[PDB]
Every structure is written in structure tokens, then in C-alpha cells.
Amino acid sequence: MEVKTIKVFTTVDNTNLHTQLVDMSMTYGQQFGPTYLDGADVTKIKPHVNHEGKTFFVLPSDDTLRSEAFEYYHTLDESFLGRYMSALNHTKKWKFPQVGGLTSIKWADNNCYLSSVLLALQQLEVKFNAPALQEAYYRARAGDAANFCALILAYSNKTVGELGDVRETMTHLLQHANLESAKRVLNVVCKHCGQKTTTLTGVEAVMYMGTLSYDNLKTGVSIPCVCGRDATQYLVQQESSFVMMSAPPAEYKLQQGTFLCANEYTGNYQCGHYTHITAKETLYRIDGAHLTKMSEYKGPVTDVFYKETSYTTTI
Ligand SMILES: [Br-]
Ligand SMILES: [Br-]
Ligand SMILES: [Br-]
Ligand SMILES: [Zn+2]
């Protein structure tokens, strides 16, 4: 005969708050659907008096929340908020030490691929379209990356603990970056057939699988011609702030003054592990919270990043 309530706020973006009166005799789940407090799932709990005035994250369940979720995350999937919160409940527990002047991630839950992605991004000029990513990234660069890591996992449909691949993760993450002005032009030349250019834009303009060497794209890559002879594919225009060269792991030597940063993959499956290498006053090998300085590195490199502004040949 009496409904006892506490006033709380619900939100999907942490800026637009919606006042709610929650009945203390019912769970949060019964009233709001899946609910989270500071990332912890409180769906099955009934309101505590001390929850008064606190802000809870909920799934976008009405027009207003859906619009707020889209504007902030650029997502239409209602479950996104749940997967983000689920991941954040874990990543908020991770440690993000400064290692060699960069924000790294202390090893946990097979997060070494995420640590490599984060280390590389900090060294590139890149900006994201979604406010949520932009903001989370600003924080990660400063040394606080729990939110950024959870968003990466949520956007890529991977869970904490799941094995990851740097190239695949970067690909999915760069699809959320503003690469509108990224452009690559290749010229394929055959002694007998002639020449033809291929233009690529966006993510495809900055990534390449097959060789770790940016110089190799410039010198030319052998390719089969429709006729049957061997043609040469040359990079003739590259307009981007960086390029990422990838290849299946194989012994490769990284030398100072020739690249921006890179990562190597040692082992397979349960023993597979990534470490990052960056070029500073000397080479730095960043392995989670561990730093090793060396004049050169030879190991199973799988991705190498290079800085760029504009590269063009006569064609
Ligand atoms: Br998760
Ligand atoms: Br940004
Ligand atoms: Br470079
Ligand atoms: Zn030909």
C-alpha cells in the first residue's frame, strides 16, 4: 500500500542524465532493464538507500536514449552499452603504467595485443569520429586508458580475455577514425601492356599486408599481368599521416632511423605474445609494464608503422 522510492539518474553517455524514481521493492532490472553502476552489473539488485543521486548506465530503450547513444558512440546496436560496461568493469582494474614515455598496459587477460595497439596509436596522428572514442582516446594518451580499451573491445565485438590480433584490431579501430583525406595511388607497369593506376582511400589507403617494408612499396612489388608476364606495382602517391605495413611473423631486423614503431609476435595460441618496439634515442622494446632499451631488434615482427605527410612520384 506504500511505494518507497529513491531518486537516481540514468544515462547512456554520462552527460545527458534522466531523473528516475526507483521502487525499492523491485530490482533495477525490473525497472530499467540491464543496469550498471560504475560498470558493475546491478541488474539483479534492489536499490540501496545509498544509491540516492547516483548515476546508472542503462541500455538505450527509448527514442531519446537511442539518439543520445548514437550521437555519442555512433552505434545503433542497443547491446553496445552492455558490452562496453562489461568490458569496462574489467579494464578499470587494469594498470596503465608510463613505459618509455608512453601509456602501456600491465599484462592481464591476454591484453598484450591491446597494449600494442594503444602504444602505436599514441605515436600516430589520428582522430576518431565518435565523441566517445575521441574523449576516451584523449584520456588514454594522458595515461588513463580503461575506457578506451573497453570501447575498442566493444566496437570490435571481442571480450576481455579473448586472444587478439593487432592488425585486425587496428583495422576495425581505423574504420572508426577520420581517414577521409587518406589516399594511395599505385601504378602497375608492364613492359608490353603499359600502365594503369589504382586508387585507394580510407583504411585501405594506409594498410598493406605482405611486406613490413614501406621502401618495398616504393621500389615496387612484383605482380602477375593479365597477359602472363611479370609487372611491377609502384606506390606513386601516398597522402596520409602514417602507413602500417604488415606480414605474417618472420625474422626481421628493425634499425634506428628507419621506422616509427612496430610490434612482434612470439609463439602461438596460448603462448602467443606481442611486444611493441618504438624508435626513440635508441630502440625501446615495451612489453606491458617492462621496458628494454636496445640499439637494434631482430625478431618475429608482424606490423611496422611509418610516419608520412605526402609522398609522390612523377606519375
Ligand atoms: Br568483456
Ligand atoms: Br580523437
Ligand atoms: Br618513419
Ligand atoms: Zn603484360
From Swiss-Prot:
Which residues does the record give as Zn(2+) 6 binding sites? 190, 193, 225, 227
The UniProt-reported impact of residue 227 to A is: Complete loss of PL-PRO activity
Cofactors needed by this protein, per the record, are:
Zn(2+)
As its record notes, the protein acts as a catalyst of: Thiol-dependent hydrolysis of ester, thioester, amide, peptide and isopeptide bonds formed by the C-terminal Gly of ubiquitin (a 76-residue protein attached to proteins as an intracellular targeting signal)
Zinc fingers (C4-type): give the ranges.
190-227
For the Ubiquitin-like domain, which residue ranges apply? 3-58
All copies of the Peptidase C16 domain together span 72-315
Subcellular location, in the record's words?
Answer: Host membrane; Host cytoplasm
Effect listed in the UniProt record for changing residue 223 to L: In strain: Isolate BJ03
Question: What are the catalytic residues?
Answer: 112, 273, 287
* Topology within the bilayer: Multi-pass membrane protein
Q: What is this protein's function? A: Responsible for the cleavages located at the N-terminus of the replicase polyprotein. In addition, PL-PRO possesses a deubiquitinating/deISGylating activity and processes both 'Lys-48'- and 'Lys-63'-linked polyubiquitin chains from cellular substrates. Plays a role in host membrane rearrangement that leads to creation of cytoplasmic double-membrane vesicles (DMV) necessary for viral replication. Nsp3, nsp4 and nsp6 together are sufficient to form DMV.
Q: What is known of its domains?
A: The hydrophobic region HD1 probably mediates the membrane association of the replication complex.
Q: What is this protein called?
A: Papain-like protease nsp3
Lineage from the top down? Viruses, Riboviria, Orthornavirae, Pisuviricota, Pisoniviricetes
Which gene is transcribed and translated to give this protein?
rep
